[PDB]
DNA sequence: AGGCCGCTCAATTGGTCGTAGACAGCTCTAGCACCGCTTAAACGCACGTACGCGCTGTCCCCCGCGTTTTAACCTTTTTGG
């Protein structure tokens, strides 16, 4: 771990993955815009890979791979106006000294997501069929989310 | 001693008066009620360190438990032929 001062770092993470030819054209499968997370706190992009779960914020990215996904819970809150889900990782998050071995999302109710995943057909049939839809029609964002953590990951959903 | 009459003073009976307060009716203030707009305050969160607390150490003055100090009682024997 480097700490880059000065407004530098960005542009230093760019170079560095310019010139270190990391694996590029990336296409995630699926992506979800704003999730307001609690543990910790940020609105979060998530954008999900075959091997992998992408958690892009305005000041830290994690790449968390699908076997350290232990359990998924999916919980509505006492409130009747909110539904959390939760994600146990191992090894847990870092966030500077501070360990995040839970990942709890906080989705409205009422919040409804359309969503095609970006998969070919020939792909879809032969790793996904059964497990993935190939849409998902306007339903809860939290419910969405949750089968495409279980499709993914492989972990049954609590 | 024991029981009964007189009395005295304080609670209660009897009767008398004046007003304190109940009742009604009226006014109108202010208390509730809502609505819109602003923004400082609250809040969620992150981060770090200082302070609270558990552990170690030292001292006091009680004590258990022991080794040691010193005294008194018992035992044995007093040439050979």
Redesign the pocket.
């Given at each position: 771990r480097l700490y880059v001062p000065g407004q530098k770092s960005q542009l230093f993470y760019e170079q560095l993955k310019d010139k270190a030819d990391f694996d590029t054209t990336s296409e995630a499968i699926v992506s979800f815009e704003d999730i307001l997370?609690?543990?910790?706190?940020?609105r979060f992009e998530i954008s999900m890979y075959a091997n992998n779960l992408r958690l892009r914020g305005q000041s830290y990215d994690y790449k968390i791979q699908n076997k350290n996904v232990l359990r998924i819970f999916s919980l509505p809150r006492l409130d009747d106006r909110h539904h959390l889900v939760i994600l146990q990782v191992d090894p847990p998050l870092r966030?500077?000294?501070?360990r995040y071995p839970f990942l709890v999302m906080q989705f409205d109710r009422n919040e409804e997501l359309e969503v095609e995943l970006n998969l070919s057909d020939e792909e879809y049939k032969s790793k996904y069929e059964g497990k993935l839809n190939r849409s998902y029609g306007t339903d809860s964002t939290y419910k969405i989310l949750s089968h495409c953590l279980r499709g993914l990951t492989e972990r049954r959903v609590i």
């Open positions: 997370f609690l543990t910790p706190r940020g966030q500077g000294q501070t």
